[model samples]
Target: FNVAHGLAWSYYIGYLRLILPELQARIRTYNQHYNNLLRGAVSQRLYILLPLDCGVPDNLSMADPNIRFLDKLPQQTGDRAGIKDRVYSNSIYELLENGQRAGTCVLEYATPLQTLFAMSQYSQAGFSREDRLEQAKLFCRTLEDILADAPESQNNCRLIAYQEPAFSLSQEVLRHLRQE
Candidate 1:
């Protein structure tokens, strides 16, 4: 079960989300099930270290009936997909929040396009050839910004070297996110 590809990390998150509730319940029955593994391995301080960025729209933030927490606003995921793309919106936020609540260390690499591009072994739905490379490039660029903010974390941070790095994201991604 060593899901090898780089994007396998993100896919692993999505794959679990697709699991049936019944199956998930059964897994939960186990004292040391796969889900519990998250709590023991990942916690808040470490977990929060893994997102690109998030935001709540000003109007939406002020009056949402869903305002359960104040620190939880300002969260957003840049839509690399242009309407037809398969990626879910705010997936990074979802993954991190899920990990925080579940107490698992489900780390998400922002803009995990390189990992997705190399996932030849899995079923890729709702993705096109043109989108793959672009997504990966965007993902890589996101990673760069995160690293810039935490130089020490980059060196001492968790490393998952299932594959080599061979791509980079351009400044265009930041510009794009800023515009929208």
Candidate 2:
């Protein structure tokens, strides 16, 4: 295997474990990440912040070029939900809220949903309409359920977007970002 391309699968699993609460020590193998994420851990479910880019397939391209930046945003690992990281925008806080509400032990943070929008760009986008709709449905329904039961409402007043549906930050967030 190419050394750079050869990732330690266990580390990704560990990273996934860290993002998920109940599976932390429990997730012992590689395939378990997807398995547990799909199944949802009961003891301490992990609230993962998927980079909308990472979550969305690469083949899809955005209808709007302005939305393409979603895939270009920085990626971070293991930073607490809301810390000043240049790579970060509102994703940290969002993950924190989702995790806390669901009794999650870990938080995964990443880019915005523009990825899916970006994906819609491809001429030969392979996903069926059903697949896309299912993805959206799962994201919305699960989130709605989590927020509905949240003990306290998450204050996303800071969640103002440069682009709304795409969920990227305005230049203002950049003005505020200082090295941590």
Candidate 3:
């Protein structure tokens, strides 16, 4: 396994775990649309931030040219999920082949709904449904800028914006957490 890539994966997962509480509160307030957001908006669950040299698909012309930069791989591997490092080189090499000049990349593994729902089983304090919903509204005020705008870049392959779904903890899990 590539050590740096491995660490990147660990950090990403850790970040999510660290923010689990905020996510739970967010979910409770938006239970109605929670699944859809996870399933649709943030359709790709796992988002990996990688250096441009590290994450790019092979076959440049064939790669998705959209702002999101979704790549089409002939075969999906564990590393494609950004879980391991074995496939890390492939993503990087692929980008090089396609002339996607950039400093960073994001590999999104779209099973985030499952992980968020599972985390919803935990409970936190001071995150009432009302307050949570209010916060959600504020968070989405500039949704377009946050999710659809691309960051300024000097590289040829600059991914400025991408779609990420709203997140909400499942009501069923929240109930269970409350019970326990």
The candidate that wins on lDDT is: 1
Residue-level lDDT tens digits of model 3 in 1-180: 122233334433444333322432332333344334233221111223221111223333333432234332222223334567332211211122234422112233212222222333457533344443333333223322332342221111211222323311122122222332
TM-score between model 2 and native = 0.25
Model 1 worst lDDT run, 10 consecutive residues: 167-176
lDDT (Cα, tens digit) per residue for candidate 2, span 87-139: 32111111112223222122222222333344456757554444544444344
- Candidate 1 accuracy as lDDT: 0.31
lDDT of 1 by residue, 60-172 (tens): 21322222221221122323437543433211112112224312221233334334544533554545555554545445454445546655444322322222233111122
Which has the higher lDDT value, candidate number 1 or candidate number 2? 1
Root-mean-square deviation of each candidate, in angstroms?
Answer: 18.4, 16.7, 19.9
Best by TM-score: 2
For each candidate in the order shown, give its overall lDDT on alpha carbons: 0.31, 0.30, 0.28
Give, for candidate 3, the lowest lDDT window spanning 10 residues: 152-161
TM-score for each candidate, following the candidate numbering: 0.24, 0.25, 0.21
Give RMSD (Å) of candidate 1 vs. truth. Answer: 18.4
